[PDB]
Chain A
Amino acid sequence: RKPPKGMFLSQEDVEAVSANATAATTVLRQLDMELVSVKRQIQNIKQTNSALKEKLDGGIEPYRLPEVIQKCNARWTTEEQLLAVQAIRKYGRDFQAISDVIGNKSVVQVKNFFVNYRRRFNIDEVLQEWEAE
């Protein structure tokens, strides 16, 4: 029912190798060529990747900023409100970003702000304005 383990023999392949007197030689050469074709394709990409790596030399170390570690506060100071309003204008409903920007207000506190100051800060007008971009 089966070839020995590791031995490969398909109806399709036998036909190909026995189609003519030199069918086998043709099959094997066309494969030798596909191989060279793939190897040069490898060296090519290797060469390109090597150049791209050379551009990332140094990584992003000189561009990193210290972290602004500050505890989360309950009350909203005028400064914070104004930061929020602008944050909403730039980010929209990305509460994480808005929280990060304000620095001392958690995600929930920000979500709440959206409801509590909805009328006073024309949050509806601001959101529709973020949508225009």
Chain B
Amino acid sequence: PSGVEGAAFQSRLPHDRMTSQEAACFPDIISGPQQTQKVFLFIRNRTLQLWLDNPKIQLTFEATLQQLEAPYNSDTVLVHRVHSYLERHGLINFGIYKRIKPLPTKKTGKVIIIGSGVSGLAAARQLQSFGMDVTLLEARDRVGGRVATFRKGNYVADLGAMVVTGLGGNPMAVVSKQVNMELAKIKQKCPLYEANGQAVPKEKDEMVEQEFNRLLEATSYLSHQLDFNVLNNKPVSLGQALEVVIQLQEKHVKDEQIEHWKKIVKTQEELKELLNKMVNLKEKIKELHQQYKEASEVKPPRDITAEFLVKSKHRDLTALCKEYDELAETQGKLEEKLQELEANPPSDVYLSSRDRQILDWHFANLEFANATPLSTLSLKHWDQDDDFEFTGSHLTVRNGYSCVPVALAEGLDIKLNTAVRQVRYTASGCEVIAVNTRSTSQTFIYKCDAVLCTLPLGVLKQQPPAVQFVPPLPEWKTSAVQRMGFGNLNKVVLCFDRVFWDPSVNLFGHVGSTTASRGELFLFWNLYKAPILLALVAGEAAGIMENISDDVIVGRCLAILKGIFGSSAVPQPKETVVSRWRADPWARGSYSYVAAGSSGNDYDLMAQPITPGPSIPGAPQPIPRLFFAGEHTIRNYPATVHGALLSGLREAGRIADQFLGAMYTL
């Protein structure tokens, strides 16, 4: 997709149609003649094109109007409306760019942002741009949150976000032109090595992967066609569905074995009946011959009855011998029909032990992608966001993903080592209570017009709470929080002084011995300038490994590698880092997932701002005061960096609309 249509696609918009959001701001247009709608769409797509063509500088209304041609550049109000609309919603002029129009010297409104991860940072830049007073309170001694990079000497390794999942339609594409991001393609070749250390032949690998995909396809059929979505009042999980599908395939293998052996008995039985006939017929023949022989003893000349006896017995004997030859013909047919079936047995098993282990590697891989065991994913909605995937190859940030948040932090007022303890929101404003993480007694009070909460879902779930809301959040919100899933996945960074692995291979797998341990160090990444190997811990293993010391974890890693590349080839690592996202009090997990019993609607609920009740009985309905952003608040792109970034852009626009007013909606 290129030209103005490419711009829409790159902004996640339909090029030939107005969105629901656009309808809300341009009700006059969407309800009017088709021609006007087409004019609007062109202005919108073109404005997006100008921004995308050069995201390093602020795209102003004046600049836009000048670059438009007749007759589009004639309706100046419509152009200005579209421009302000895009700007306000963060579709243009987001991230880090050179500002043309200086920031208003005197600011309007005060906003406190809890958390300085990508969602918080993106919202802050926007709010600052719109002219608001913004302060971010961050518990950690750094910015970035779940975007955390290990840096020591020349060693660089991401402990959090690491992959950019395609640039087609990804807002990170704009960010990568603004920030010194060194993107490198991830080669998809990934050999797997069984526990014994020997590689998996191409044939197996492909067959098992095809089956893995077939089984996923099968659970989808089980969900949409057999409506197997509730079992014993409980929502069915992906794991359960897969177990059922596999059991059914095992059943089919046995059903076929049975029908095969039943064809053998049926034939084997027909043979018995034929043989019985033959044995009885041979007796009759044996007897007739004896009679014929006796009749032939009456030598001629003999009366006609004696002659008749000889001739008669002869005929009866021949007739019976003909019957025997016919049955012998049938015997040869049945006998061979048996050597045929005996030689063509159906399959012995659905999946051998080896096949199951390799299959478990694929499941571990899926558990890693969703940062959760398959038994916790909603069968109905686990892949609710698949239709929104970006295009292009997956990439990694060669210089460490932290370069993004660090850059987004430029010029912002950030209070590090400040842990928010309480959020108070009332009809006339909010107050946030925070402590200094280095000496908890030291307390801070921040008064503001609005609060943007970007605390991770893991933190929001903490019981008893880590952050108290006063008044408490309503049940519609807390229930969404309880329902949503909050996963976990960990990484083990191994820094070596030499390269003992295949340098042309970006990643390789380790196939576990049992299903229980499938996610334990199942995948290794070779990705940076330095000789570094990154090991992954997924699924059920993630949670358990957190209770294991680094040395024992690293020991296991080395053991695996020695088994693959040879004992003498693998040296002791010079530096090792092990992440523990679940234990991290500021994260309490890695990222959200659609839990069984949940749905994409919960992400919408997480996103709805809270409006306090009036302070005075009978006083009019207040303004919303408490807003939410973060990866767990964006239905179409949850659990990602771009999702977090987009959530911040969204809330910044909503806050600004609420407190600064909208001049583009009229």
Contact = CB atoms under 8 A, between A and B. Distances in A.
Given A14-B226, A42-B265, A65-B318, A56 B275 contact: yes
B311 A103 contact: yes
B507 interface: no
A11 B227 CA distance: 9
A27 B251 contact: yes
B255 A31 contact: yes
Interface string A57-83: 001101111001000000000010011
A38 B255 CA distance: 13
B268 A42 contact: yes
Interface stretch (B27-35, B75-83, B162-170, B301-309): B301-309
Contacts of A90: 312
Contacts of A132: none
Contact of B221 (A3, A49, A100): A3
A103 B310 CA distance: 12
Contacts of B282: 55-56, 60
B262 A38 contact: yes
A56 B278 contact: yes
A115 interface: no
B264 A42 contact: yes
Interface string B248-269: 1111101101100110110011
Interface residues on B, range: 35 or more
Majority DSSP secondary structure for residues of A touching B: helix
A1 interface: yes
A3 to B, nearest CB: 5
B251 A28 contact: yes
B207 to A, nearest CB: 12
A1 B221 CA distance: 8
Contacts of B276: 52
B289 A18 contact: no
A13 B248 contact: yes
Interface in B292-324: 292, 304-305, 307-308, 311-312, 314-315, 317-319, 321, 324
Contact of A52 (B222, B264, B272): B272
B248 A48 contact: no
A35 B254 CA distance: 8
B54 interface: no
A83 B261 CA distance: 55
A48 B276 CA distance: 10
Contacts of B249: 7-8
A69 to B, nearest CB: 13
A25 B319 CA distance: 58
B268 A17 contact: no
Contacts of B63: none
A57 to B, nearest CB: 10
Contacts of B268: 42, 45-46, 49
Contacts of B233: none
B231 interface: yes
A63 B289 contact: yes
A3 B257 contact: no
Contact of B244 (A4, A17, A32, A64): A17
Nearest to A2: B221
Nearest to A55: B279
B245 interface: yes
B4 to A, nearest CB: 39
Contacts of B269: 45
Contacts of B505: none
B271 A49 contact: yes
A73 to B, nearest CB: 15
B184 interface: no
A31 B239 CA distance: 24
B286 interface: yes
Nearest to B269: A45
Contact of A63 (B261, B307, B317): B317
B315 A100 contact: yes
B664 interface: no
Contacts of B231: 18
A7 B314 CA distance: 62
A58 to B, nearest CB: 9
B390 interface: no
B247 interface: yes
A79 B317 contact: no
A34 interface: yes
Contacts of A64: 321
Given A4-B217, A14-B226, A60-B321, A28 B247 contact: yes
A7 B222 CA distance: 11
B607 to A, nearest CB: 36
B254 A83 contact: no
Contacts of A2: 221
A75 to B, nearest CB: 17
Contacts of A28: 247, 250-251, 254
B466 interface: no
B199 interface: no
A108 interface: no
Contact of B245 (A1, A9, A52, A68): A9
The 7 closest A-B pairs by CB, nearest first: A52-B275, A31-B254, A8-B252, A82-B304, A63-B289, A24-B247, A86-B308
Interface of B: 214, 217-218, 221-222, 225-226, 228, 231, 244-245, 247-252, 254-255, 257-258, 261-262, 264-265, 268-269, 271-272, 275-276, 278-279, 282, 285-286, 288-289, 292, 304-305, 307-308, 311-312, 314-315, 317-319, 321, 324, 328
Given A13-B248, A32-B254, 4 more contacts: A24-B247, A86-B308, A87-B312, A100-B318
10 contacts: A9-B226, A18-B231, A31-B251, A31-B255, A38-B258, A59-B324, A68-B314, A82-B304, A82-B308, A101-B311
Interface of A: 1-4, 6-9, 11, 13-14, 17-18, 24, 27-28, 31-32, 34-35, 38-39, 41-42, 45-46, 48-49, 52-53, 55-56, 59-60, 62-65, 68, 79, 82-83, 86-87, 90, 97, 100-103
